[PDB]
Design a protein. Structure first.
Lengths: 101, 154
């Protein structure tokens, strides 16, 4: 609920019901850090950079993880991002995920 | 306000309690947290008779984009050019991780000062000299430190 939680990126605490829990890891991220990280990754990096800013997970080298990860991240990004950035997410996702190793 | 301001205030509060050993005299205007000045004070020959002023320039998008380091003091080193640009892999755009904090960046910088990386140099002449005959390199670097370096603090 309203108990405070430290942002894993910037180190500042907010009520937990304002924070963004990344479904794939246990990091809690504040809304501003969340929006900035994923917006910059979309506009300036690759869709493989769409991972946690504090721990770098998940490992997007496992193709069996991609649908679960990106479909859950989708819902968080729709509420967080500006409409143009959310549309860019879908464009990049439609273009595919480069599989590193 | 911005992620950069929150994050850099966090980093500064952690440095101000645990001062860094080889990075001293850290100066940051609380009105502009995106530029830090400080003094690099190396521990080993050939650089341990001088100190080196540096500036850390953080982008407005920090910590989601890396800082840049510029030496203001001249230094004789294969990985630092004559304009003070430093090739430091941990803060390259291709390597940058937003979780990296400035204390780790400085530790990485000091490790580079201690152990040049002549395989990827900004001054190929000095990289050759460091690889073929370090004793000669070390004498040249000591003299350059004496001639153009800054005075060390106590
Ligand atoms: Zn934050
Ligand atoms: Zn995480």
């Amino acid at each position: 609920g309203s108990e405070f939680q430290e942002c894993a990126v910037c180190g500042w605490a907010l009520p937990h019901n304002r924070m963004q829990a990344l479904t794939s890891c246990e990091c809690t991220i504040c809304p501003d850090c969340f929006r900035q990280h994923f917006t910059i990754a979309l506009k300036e990096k690759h869709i493989t950079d769409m991972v946690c800013p504090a721990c770098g997970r998940p490992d997007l080298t496992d193709d069996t993880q991609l649908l679960s990860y990106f479909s859950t991240l989708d819902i968080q990004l729709r509420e967080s991002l500006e409409p143009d950035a959310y549309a860019l997410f879908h464009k990049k996702l439609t273009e595919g995920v480069l599989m590193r190793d | 306000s911005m992620a950069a301001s929150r994050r850099l205030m966090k980093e500064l509060e952690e440095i101000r309690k645990c001062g860094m050993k080889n990075f001293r005299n850290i100066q940051v205007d609380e009105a502009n947290l995106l530029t830090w000045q400080g003094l690099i004070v190396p521990d080993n020959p050939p650089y341990d008779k001088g100190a080196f002023r540096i500036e850390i320039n953080f982008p407005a998008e920090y910590p989601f984009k890396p800082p840049k380091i510029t030496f203001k003091t001249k230094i004789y080193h294969p990985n630092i050019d004559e304009k003070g640009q430093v090739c430091l892999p941990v803060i390259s755009a291709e390597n940058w991780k937003p979780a990296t904090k400035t204390d780790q960046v400085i530790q990485s910088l000091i490790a580079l000062v201690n152990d040049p990386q002549p395989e990827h140099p900004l001054r190929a002449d000095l990289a050759e000299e460091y690889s073929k005959d370090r004793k000669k390199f070390c004498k040249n670097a000591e003299e350059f430190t004496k001639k153009y370096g800054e005075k060390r603090p106590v």
